[PDB]
Design a protein around this motif. Structure first.
Motif, PDB file in Angstrom:
ATOM      1  N   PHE E   1       0.826  -1.203   0.000  1.00  0.00           N
ATOM      2  CA  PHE E   1       0.000   0.000   0.000  1.00  0.00           C
ATOM      3  C   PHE E   1       0.863   1.259   0.000  1.00  0.00           C
ATOM      4  CE2 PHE E   1      -2.516  -3.241   2.324  1.00  0.00           C
ATOM      5  CZ  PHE E   1      -3.578  -3.349   1.448  1.00  0.00           C
ATOM      6  N   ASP E   2       2.179   1.062  -0.011  1.00  0.00           N
ATOM      7  CA  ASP E   2       3.147   2.149   0.132  1.00  0.00           C
ATOM      8  C   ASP E   2       3.038   3.245  -0.933  1.00  0.00           C
ATOM      9  OD1 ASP E   2       4.220  -0.646   0.895  1.00  0.00           O
ATOM     10  OD2 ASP E   2       5.424   0.691   2.154  1.00  0.00           O
ATOM     11  N   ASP E   3       2.600   2.877  -2.134  1.00  0.00           N
ATOM     12  CA  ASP E   3       2.513   3.829  -3.240  1.00  0.00           C
ATOM     13  C   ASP E   3       1.348   4.807  -3.089  1.00  0.00           C
ATOM     14  OD1 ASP E   3       0.993   1.427  -3.613  1.00  0.00           O
ATOM     15  OD2 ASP E   3       0.521   2.100  -5.650  1.00  0.00           O
ATOM     16  N   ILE E   4       0.236   4.323  -2.546  1.00  0.00           N
ATOM     17  CA  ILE E   4      -0.938   5.162  -2.328  1.00  0.00           C
ATOM     18  C   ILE E   4      -0.684   6.129  -1.176  1.00  0.00           C
ATOM     19  CG2 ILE E   4      -3.423   5.207  -1.910  1.00  0.00           C
ATOM     20  CD1 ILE E   4      -3.626   2.400  -2.905  1.00  0.00           C
ATOM     21  N   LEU E   5       0.005   5.635  -0.152  1.00  0.00           N
ATOM     22  CA  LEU E   5       0.384   6.440   1.003  1.00  0.00           C
ATOM     23  C   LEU E   5       1.274   7.614   0.596  1.00  0.00           C
ATOM     24  CD1 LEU E   5       1.080   3.551   3.548  1.00  0.00           C
ATOM     25  CD2 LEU E   5      -0.952   5.013   3.396  1.00  0.00           C
ATOM     26  N   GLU E   7       1.370   9.024  -2.308  1.00  0.00           N
ATOM     27  CA  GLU E   7       0.594   9.934  -3.151  1.00  0.00           C
ATOM     28  C   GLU E   7      -0.148  10.994  -2.335  1.00  0.00           C
ATOM     29  OE1 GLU E   7      -2.348   7.971  -5.519  1.00  0.00           O
ATOM     30  OE2 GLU E   7      -3.061   9.816  -6.475  1.00  0.00           O
ATOM     31  N   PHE E   8      -0.578  10.624  -1.132  1.00  0.00           N
ATOM     32  CA  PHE E   8      -1.320  11.540  -0.271  1.00  0.00           C
ATOM     33  C   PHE E   8      -0.420  12.599   0.360  1.00  0.00           C
ATOM     34  CE2 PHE E   8      -3.008  12.791   3.886  1.00  0.00           C
ATOM     35  CZ  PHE E   8      -4.252  13.273   3.524  1.00  0.00           C
ATOM     36  N   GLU E   9       0.813  12.217   0.673  1.00  0.00           N
ATOM     37  CA  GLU E   9       1.758  13.117   1.326  1.00  0.00           C
ATOM     38  C   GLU E   9       2.067  14.350   0.479  1.00  0.00           C
ATOM     39  OE1 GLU E   9       5.212  11.185   2.934  1.00  0.00           O
ATOM     40  OE2 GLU E   9       4.132   9.291   3.209  1.00  0.00           O
ATOM     41  N   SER E  10       2.079  14.175  -0.839  1.00  0.00           N
ATOM     42  CA  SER E  10       2.344  15.278  -1.757  1.00  0.00           C
ATOM     43  C   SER E  10       1.095  15.655  -2.550  1.00  0.00           C
ATOM     44  CB  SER E  10       3.486  14.918  -2.710  1.00  0.00           C
ATOM     45  OG  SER E  10       3.226  13.697  -3.377  1.00  0.00           O
TER      46      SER E  10
END
Lengths: 10, 424, 431, 296, 10
Positions: E1-5, E7-10
């Motif tokens: 799930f690391d890629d979706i996480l 995406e939210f940070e930026s």
């Protein structure tokens, strides 16, 4: 007074 | 002072290897010493709804709380808790509560939507039913907890105040206090039962919210105390609404016993759900008897006067006085519930109506007696306390038969005074 | 019970001839026995801003309070106070506080605009920066005072109530209470029988309540630091029925973590101030728990919600924290700080000028930590717990991220339920 | 600690067979041990207003409260109480209070519309002037009660912090607390007058409301403590508006006489109604001196 | 799930 009391109960 | 792990209606081991962890209207939870481990059993009174089960306790849970959706288990020393939903649909979860040096978990509680943990250092930790923490709070040392839906009733102890209590709601957003560390006028324990008071120093046999949402507590004096008017900080009062010692005395035909005791489970409207313990000890044994029902009674009966009039029979005049008080109190509580929180079970409106009926009826019997004793002044005072206009009418008729014309005029003044207010 | 003269982060003489009168983020004030008199030194941590100075104390000041514009000195027995502005613009002034028989000054405090004096009989005397007296108030016996701008945080003690606190504002005309003598759930020191030969016994004779320090946070929330070495912050103090004390730092646990999961006996924390999310302090290495001379450089200790267990931290191993377990604490901490800061801005507005960005970053950290918990819940097929976590999300863009996580986890019922949250919020947004 | 039966300005038997049950600005009530029972006398100071009377006490009342409309009697061990209206037009009534094992009535009080009973277990029982029960409340153990109209001032004892007081209004709606078990700043007792402190351990000589509604207490330190601004929490303080020791010394010209003691009756706006006692005992005996007045 | 996480940070 039981008749008046009884009258009030119903 | 040593804080002991509290659970509602829990019992000590005594000379056995088993005891009850907790106990209420839903059911009972017992633990048995299994060599180096424990065997926990969760039972239910409604065998239809839930299925009795058991499991092996590798931690030594000494804290428990039972509700209609799950069971909460706690370990006072290691700080490990576990929540087990009754249905297999939802998963169990486990957590370890952080504990400083000398800090013990003193009490746990759970609702379908909240899990609560209290410690001896006054740490108040809350979670949702899935173990998601909401906030850690610091309060006075906690000795006992209970909860219902989103509301929490907590008992605290210091070296300064003695026993106090707080009443709060754990809403979606924040925690709000209805009452913050107010005096708790529960009598402390002042022997064959010494094992119990080493197990429960405060003598709090149980505590709980009533079915209608009013906080209750049951101490070593075996009197059921109910908190009234808790929504108004300046008006809140603790009411003794059942002297269970006196009820047992009445049940035994006016005879003093030593082998019958009451173990409180819950309060449902006007009835204390309990276990009647027959034996030397004051706590229930194995197997657990079927629950009994004990109707609450205002503590206004005198033994000496009950003996003169003779299960004990009660003089209609003395019975009417208690019925008046009991109806008055229950009516005031229930009305306050409906005026603020509304209904919960679906029959409250009908209960309140019957309640007010019982009130005026008992009041009219007192009015009759006062008229029979030519006590016009006392009769008028009683008349003022009537609720129904139909009861004032009946009072007028009673005054007429009693041939008290001065009373009739003054009561008719009450009726007209109310009719006049009706025109505004 | 004997009321002792209190000052924030003050230390006792102990077995030496010098001690610190008071101590905070601005600097430190020390006194040295000079034969029959004393030598007081006022030092600062921002050596650029202020210049260290000293003077001879012929009075024996045992009370002190330091702020950014001046220093207040107090004498507990004679009732003499003196305010000394750092700058030459305003002159020093001296006053003698009236004291009945047996009445002592127990605590003093000063801001750039207010001077407060508390006594053992509970007399509360306040002045402006020039010594113009306000109305005199009678309260419970005062044991400790701190202040910030126009607001005062006071601690009281009786044999009846125990510890209480008040929170007030000293307006132009009168004093107004946010909170009046509410319960103060600070743990008292539990002194044993083996303490009569203990090396630190001297501190609890000097400070019986064990209040190492107390202060307003940089954002204006009352804090207190007792002998249990836990930082307690008062939340929701603007709402009497909602006010709560929150433990936001177990410094014993942090030291344990710093020492790589090892129990120590020679490292202690001395609290100076709270800056947003960071405890300014002195790390005291030695037998005693209070700092001595020379004074170490100030350290920083980030606040942490007390939700970590030693046994579970060891198994996953300076101590490293499992990313999943770390997410719970970060969620809780962000939740608390966000809620506090939001209340500050909605009532007092900004003070430093960057709070809104701080709050914005805060809410960002909040949803992010929450999503990590949501991810874990999804991995364990725990749809119920995941949905509960989703409800706690703030930004609508965070709800989106949860849906995408749910989609990859192949939990279609969860996706619909999360989108219901989006729709439900859109409906309430139009009302 | 012992819970002794309390009444305002009551006196002990001592070595004699008589004593005052209670005492205030309205009058004084006394009881006398006779051959087999007791004899209670109710006297008034305004003889033109009320009819003095006496009756045989078969029960042995040790509690009493007096007002302008009637007299309330109580028996601490059997829980029996009796209310006697001053006017014959109104009927006397008797009632027995339920008592658990070891529980004693510790104080009673009455107004024209209320009757109050307090116990050592903290049971607070209220009635109207005709005996109809209105409520039963559980509080801290009660040691002293007084009342005025609908207001009640009660002193409680706790194991943990000692004496506390509550102030409440028993209106038609519901009992409202203005003060709930707050600190009572009264000095406890620190000999010839030994029988008195055995009779009243807490040393509360009397307590009452002022004519303007303020709770007053009078302890062994002989200082009239007044609770002002009790309607406002942020400014309710106890005021020592009278040190009777000083006023006696002034009346003595400047000579410390251990012959004179003050016995509080009431507070009427500007003056303290009292009994100036001359003798070895600090409590009045028979006959009763004329009521004095002290300026505030 | 690391890629979706991320995406939210930026």
């Amino acid at each position: 007074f039981d008749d008046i009391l009884g009258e009030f109960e119903s | 002072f040593r804080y002991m792990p509290f659970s509602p209606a829990g019992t000590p081991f005594g000379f056995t290897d088993r005891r009850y962890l907790t106990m209420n209207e839903v059911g009972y939870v017992s633990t048995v010493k299994n060599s180096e481990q424990y065997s926990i059993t969760v039972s239910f009174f409604d065998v239809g709804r839930f299925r009795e089960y058991h499991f092996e306790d590798l931690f030594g849970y000494d804290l428990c709380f039972l509700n209609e959706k799950g069971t909460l288990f706690g370990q006072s020393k290691t700080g490990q808790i576990q929540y087990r939903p009754h249905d297999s649909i939802h998963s169990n979860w486990t957590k370890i509560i952080p504990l400083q040096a000398g800090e013990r978990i003193t009490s746990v509680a759970a609702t379908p939507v909240r899990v609560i943990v209290g410690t001896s250092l006054g740490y108040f930790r809350s979670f949702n039913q899935f173990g998601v923490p909401f906030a850690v709070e610091k309060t006075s040392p906690i000795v006992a907890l209970t909860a219902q839906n989103y509301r929490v009733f907590s008992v605290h102890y210091s070296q300064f105040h003695g026993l106090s209590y707080s009443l709060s709601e754990l809403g979606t957003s924040s925690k709000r206090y209805y009452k913050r560390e107010c005096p708790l006028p529960m009598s402390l324990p002042n022997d064959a039962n010494l094992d119990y008071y080493n197990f429960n120093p405060m003598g709090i046999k149980s505590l709980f919210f009533s079915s209608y949402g009013d906080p209750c507590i049951f101490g070593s004096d075996n009197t059921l105390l109910l908190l009234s008017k808790w929504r108004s900080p300046e008006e809140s009062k603790w009411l003794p609404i059942l002297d269970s010692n006196m009820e047992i005395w009445k049940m035994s035909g006016g005879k003093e016993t030593t082998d019958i005791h009451v173990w409180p489970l819950a309060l449902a409207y006007d009835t204390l759900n309990c276990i009647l313990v027959k034996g030397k000890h004051i706590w229930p044994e194995f197997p657990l008897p079927l629950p009994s029902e004990m109707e609450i009674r205002m503590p206004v009966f005198v033994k000496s006067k009950l003996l003169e009039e003779n299960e004990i029979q009660i003089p209609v005049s003395m019975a009417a006085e208690e019925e008046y008080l009991r109806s008055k109190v229950l009516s005031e509580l229930l009305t306050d519930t409906l005026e603020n929180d509304g209904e919960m079970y679906g029959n409250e409106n009908e209960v309140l109506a019957a309640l007010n009926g019982a009130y005026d009826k008992a009041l009219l019997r007192l009015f009759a007696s006062a008229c029979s004793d030519q006590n016009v002044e006392k009769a008028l005072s009683l008349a003022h306390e009537l609720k129904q206009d139909r009861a004032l009418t009946a009072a007028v008729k009673i005054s007429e038969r009693a041939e008290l014309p001065s009373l009739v005029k003054k009561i008719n003044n009450i009726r007209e005074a109310r009719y006049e207010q009706q025109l505004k």
